[model samples]
Target: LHFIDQHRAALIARVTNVEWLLDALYGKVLTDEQYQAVRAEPTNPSKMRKLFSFTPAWNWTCKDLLLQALRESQSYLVEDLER
Candidate 1:
């Protein structure tokens, strides 16, 4: 399984600036509705939860794009989780 797949809860819990991740994922990994759905959430963790809810429909490359979004937005967090 991918690291993101294995660490869904931790990502949801730990990603502080989730809006940046959402911005990275917007056009490629998420459609307008999916993007809006995530943004509609009030809190960061809930936004991550909403964003991840769409992952079940994505392929490995899509997941990788999401991982890259995290890499760009939350470098330290993703680096730590890569272990």
Candidate 2:
């Protein structure tokens, strides 16, 4: 039970950071497509994989949550399409 509490605290902290960034960016952190994909039902593995593959500018680390947040923040696709 103690370990579970600690785990939940850490998880909460991480998710809070996510929400903070999402707010700081004026809810524009995620485009319509990415946010829709993330919140979808029955989760599509392939789409999930591609979306999660996005990362910080330096390809920082393999961790999922932060990387997901990073992708949602940047407009890689939209920028490319405009080129």
Candidate 3:
């Protein structure tokens, strides 16, 4: 929703726990291809966009997982992004 789109560039910059977020989303939210794509990283920044690139097709269930997982691991960042 607003959280993902609105904060994409910021999240790409500030999200330090993307690996954890990816793991949390794997299987449930991410397809195997997407997981491997994220795992194959140039760096965190590149890795983040790789995931973000896939999210355009996602429904609210997927968005909720991303937000929920983000909050569980990066709640402080999420709160800052919310503002």
Candidate 4:
């Protein structure tokens, strides 16, 4: 996974398709009604966090076999902390 992580910056940098989709939805192309509907912009920042909550640092996969092996296992330790 180190390879992917190392190449992530290049992937994200050249993400034109996603950029185009975002522009098509949120840019000047929006109609008055469309813009009105998005006036109160909705955002879901926790999508990725929720998806990977069970395995925070790494994903479950053959590619991550080494990382999974080296990863320190632990029991659930809970504490209340407000950031």
lDDT of 2 at 62: 29
In candidate 4, clashing pairs total 0
The Cα local distance difference test for each model comes to: 0.83, 0.38, 0.87, 0.32
lDDT rank order: 3, 1, 2, 4
Model 1 scores a C-alpha lDDT of 0.83
RMSD of candidate 1 to the truth, in angstroms, is 1.3
For model 2, residues 3-24, the per-residue Cα lDDT tens digits are: 2123333333233233333343
Looking at model 2, report the run of 10 residues with the lowest lDDT sum.
Answer: 1-10
Off by over 4 Å in 3: none
- Candidate 4 per-residue lDDT, tens place, 25-73, comes to 3433334554444333333223212212323345435225422322322
Winning model by lDDT: 3
| TM-score of each candidate structure, all chains considered together | 0.90, 0.25, 0.92, 0.23
Superposed Cα RMSD, model 3: 1.0
Please, what are the lDDT tens digits per residue for candidate 1 over residues 1-83?
39888998898899898778778877888889988888899998888888878888888898888777778887899879887
* Error of model 1, residue 20, in angstroms: 1.1
Q: 1-83, model 3: which lDDT tens digit per residue? A: 56888888998988888789988998888889889988898888998889888987899888988988989998799898887
Candidate 3 global lDDT:
0.87
